[PDB]
Write an enzyme that holds these catalytic residues in place. Structure first.
Site, mmCIF file in Angstrom:
data_model
loop_
_atom_site.group_PDB
_atom_site.id
_atom_site.type_symbol
_atom_site.label_atom_id
_atom_site.label_comp_id
_atom_site.label_asym_id
_atom_site.label_seq_id
_atom_site.Cartn_x
_atom_site.Cartn_y
_atom_site.Cartn_z
ATOM 1 N N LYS A 132 12.681 -1.429 1.635
ATOM 2 C CA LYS A 132 11.257 -1.141 1.560
ATOM 3 C C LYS A 132 11.075 0.387 1.417
ATOM 4 C CE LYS A 132 6.957 -1.579 4.393
ATOM 5 N NZ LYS A 132 6.194 -2.557 5.299
ATOM 6 N N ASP A 148 -1.618 -8.427 11.850
ATOM 7 C CA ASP A 148 -1.773 -8.432 10.387
ATOM 8 C C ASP A 148 -1.160 -9.675 9.758
ATOM 9 O OD1 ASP A 148 -2.825 -7.406 8.037
ATOM 10 O OD2 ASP A 148 -1.117 -6.087 7.627
ATOM 11 N N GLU A 201 15.992 -7.732 6.053
ATOM 12 C CA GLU A 201 16.499 -9.034 5.633
ATOM 13 C C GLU A 201 15.795 -9.470 4.343
ATOM 14 O OE1 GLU A 201 15.660 -12.131 8.487
ATOM 15 O OE2 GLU A 201 16.209 -13.731 7.081
ATOM 16 N N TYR A 202 16.583 -9.907 3.364
ATOM 17 C CA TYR A 202 16.052 -10.438 2.102
ATOM 18 C C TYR A 202 15.573 -11.894 2.247
ATOM 19 C CZ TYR A 202 16.648 -12.702 -2.577
ATOM 20 O OH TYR A 202 16.496 -13.454 -3.719
ATOM 21 N N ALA A 203 14.315 -12.153 1.883
ATOM 22 C CA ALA A 203 13.747 -13.504 1.897
ATOM 23 C C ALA A 203 13.706 -14.084 0.489
ATOM 24 C CB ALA A 203 12.328 -13.480 2.496
ATOM 25 N N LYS A 230 0.844 -1.204 0.000
ATOM 26 C CA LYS A 230 0.000 0.000 0.000
ATOM 27 C C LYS A 230 0.871 1.243 0.000
ATOM 28 N N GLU A 273 0.410 -12.856 2.355
ATOM 29 C CA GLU A 273 1.310 -11.905 1.678
ATOM 30 C C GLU A 273 2.341 -11.291 2.633
ATOM 31 O OE1 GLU A 273 -1.249 -7.730 1.509
ATOM 32 O OE2 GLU A 273 -2.128 -9.592 0.724
ATOM 33 N N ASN A 274 2.126 -11.457 3.938
ATOM 34 C CA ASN A 274 3.059 -10.969 4.955
ATOM 35 C C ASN A 274 3.893 -12.088 5.570
ATOM 36 O OD1 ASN A 274 2.323 -8.280 4.693
ATOM 37 N ND2 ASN A 274 0.849 -8.302 6.379
HETATM 38 N N1 ADP Z 1 12.294 -8.754 2.874
HETATM 39 C C1 ADP Z 1 11.611 -9.113 1.751
HETATM 40 N N2 ADP Z 1 12.074 -10.059 0.898
HETATM 41 C C2 ADP Z 1 11.378 -10.405 -0.209
HETATM 42 N N3 ADP Z 1 10.200 -9.861 -0.562
HETATM 43 C C3 ADP Z 1 9.618 -8.902 0.219
HETATM 44 C C4 ADP Z 1 10.318 -8.471 1.439
HETATM 45 N N4 ADP Z 1 9.547 -7.534 2.035
HETATM 46 C C5 ADP Z 1 8.462 -7.362 1.247
HETATM 47 N N5 ADP Z 1 8.491 -8.178 0.172
HETATM 48 C C6 ADP Z 1 7.444 -8.217 -0.876
HETATM 49 O O1 ADP Z 1 6.808 -6.914 -0.944
HETATM 50 C C7 ADP Z 1 5.462 -7.007 -0.461
HETATM 51 C C8 ADP Z 1 5.098 -5.797 0.425
HETATM 52 O O2 ADP Z 1 5.922 -5.726 1.599
HETATM 53 P P1 ADP Z 1 5.266 -5.242 3.022
HETATM 54 O O3 ADP Z 1 6.441 -4.989 3.931
HETATM 55 O O4 ADP Z 1 4.224 -6.271 3.443
HETATM 56 O O5 ADP Z 1 4.518 -3.876 2.567
HETATM 57 P P2 ADP Z 1 3.103 -3.278 3.115
HETATM 58 O O6 ADP Z 1 3.409 -2.831 4.507
HETATM 59 O O7 ADP Z 1 2.852 -2.176 2.125
HETATM 60 O O8 ADP Z 1 2.089 -4.396 3.000
HETATM 61 C C9 ADP Z 1 5.401 -8.327 0.302
HETATM 62 O O9 ADP Z 1 4.062 -8.852 0.353
HETATM 63 C C10 ADP Z 1 6.364 -9.201 -0.478
HETATM 64 O O10 ADP Z 1 5.704 -9.607 -1.674
HETATM 65 MG MG MG Z 2 2.764 -1.785 6.357
HETATM 66 MG MG MG Z 3 2.259 -6.285 3.784
#
Ligand code: ADP
Ligand code: MG
Ligand code: MG
Ligand code: JRW
Ligand code: CL
Length: 265
Positions: A36, A130, A85-87, A17, A134-135
């Site tokens: 991010k 939350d 951290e990269y996943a 978002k 997706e999280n």
């Molecule tokens: N550390 C990470 N490694 C790999 N992909 C990520 C990572 N952080 C976020 N993503 C991707 O980006 C998307 C949004 O990150 P997020 O931190 O959940 O943002 P928001 O707070 O806007 O929901 C995640 O759902 C995932 O697809």
């Molecule tokens: Mg957020």
């Molecule tokens: Mg998210």
């Protein structure tokens, strides 16, 4: 301390978002991480500065193998950057889209990893609020890692911020705007266990108004293939009265979990 000039930016990892997340490499160390990115103008109109401070404060002090690390942040004239951290194996959301449903072993294993991480969180009286596919991110050995602490807080709590997205993972007390606590994460864990086995969350519907009705009345049913043991665990988690929801220790010791999970507590 850090600045944009310290990193080489690569491909987009995913979108949020607020949150456009990129692969990156720190120039001097060659350390690979995720950045991010958030737009200040958007955060300012949304008025969510307090939530962003919590995200950094809470997640940076947590240390657990099933929780994603946050190493720090910096900002310039137009943006804020969270250093994560990269996943490398993506979201659980993606994996569910790929396979439609997870088998019992994959499901029980994810639930164990989640329960382990939530147990560590609640010992510090932190609630995530939350939890959804997706999280949930995947590490190099395929292990689950909880991420996105933008909604997290210290318990007990009310809710001083407008809900924007989906109601699908929220408990009755949070939806009806009542006071809430740690038991909210246990309800979400029930929703996830159902969505892993079936392919969709148990209260899903075509309109906000009707999803609200299904959640507040706890109206859900099981397809024929869901086993007796999975049904037992899910029904115990999705209790309207939060005090009736089990402790996490009881989740980790449930016969269906211990029979099917390939990970220990
Ligand atoms: N550390 C990470 N490694 C790999 N992909 C990520 C990572 N952080 C976020 N993503 C991707 O980006 C998307 C949004 O990150 P997020 O931190 O959940 O943002 P928001 O707070 O806007 O929901 C995640 O759902 C995932 O697809
Ligand atoms: Mg957020
Ligand atoms: Mg998210
Ligand atoms: C993690 C984090 C939480 C809050 C904020 C920053 C980083 C970035 N610094 C500030 C500066 C100091 C005013 C403070 C700020 O509230 N913020 C927001 C306005 C929209 C970003 C900023 O620009
Ligand atoms: Cl700050």
């Amino acid at each position: 301390q850090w600045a944009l000039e310290d990193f080489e930016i690569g491909r987009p990892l995913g979108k949020g978002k607020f949150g456009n997340v990129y692969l990156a490499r720190e120039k001097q160390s060659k350390f690979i991480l995720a950045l991010k990115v958030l737009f200040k103008a958007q955060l300012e109109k949304a008025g969510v500065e307090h939530q962003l401070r919590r995200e950094v404060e809470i997640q940076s002090h947590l240390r657990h193998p099933n929780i994603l690390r946050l190493y720090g942040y910096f900002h310039d004239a137009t943006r804020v950057y969270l250093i994560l951290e990269y996943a490398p194996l993506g979201t659980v959301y993606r994996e569910l889209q790929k396979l439609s449903k997870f088998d019992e072993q994959r499901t029980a294993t994810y639930i164990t990893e989640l329960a382990n991480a939530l147990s560590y969180c609640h010992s510090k009286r932190v609630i995530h609020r939350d939890i959804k596919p997706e999280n949930l991110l995947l590490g190099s050995a395929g292990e689950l890692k909880i991420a996105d602490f933008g909604w997290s807080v210290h318990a007990p709590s009310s809710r001083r911020t407008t809900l924007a997205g989906t109601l699908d993972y929220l408990p009755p007390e949070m939806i009806e705007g009542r006071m809430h606590d740690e038991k909210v994460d246990l309800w979400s864990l029930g929703v996830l266990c159902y969505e892993f086995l079936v392919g969709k969350p148990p209260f899903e519907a075509n309109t906000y108004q009707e999803t609200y009705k299904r959640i507040s009345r706890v109206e859900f049913t099981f397809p024929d293939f869901v086993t007796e043991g999975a049904r037992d665990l899910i029904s115990r988690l999705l209790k309207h009265n939060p005090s009736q929801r089990p402790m996490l220790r009881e989740v980790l010791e449930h016969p269906w979990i211990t029979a099917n999970s390939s990970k220990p507590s």
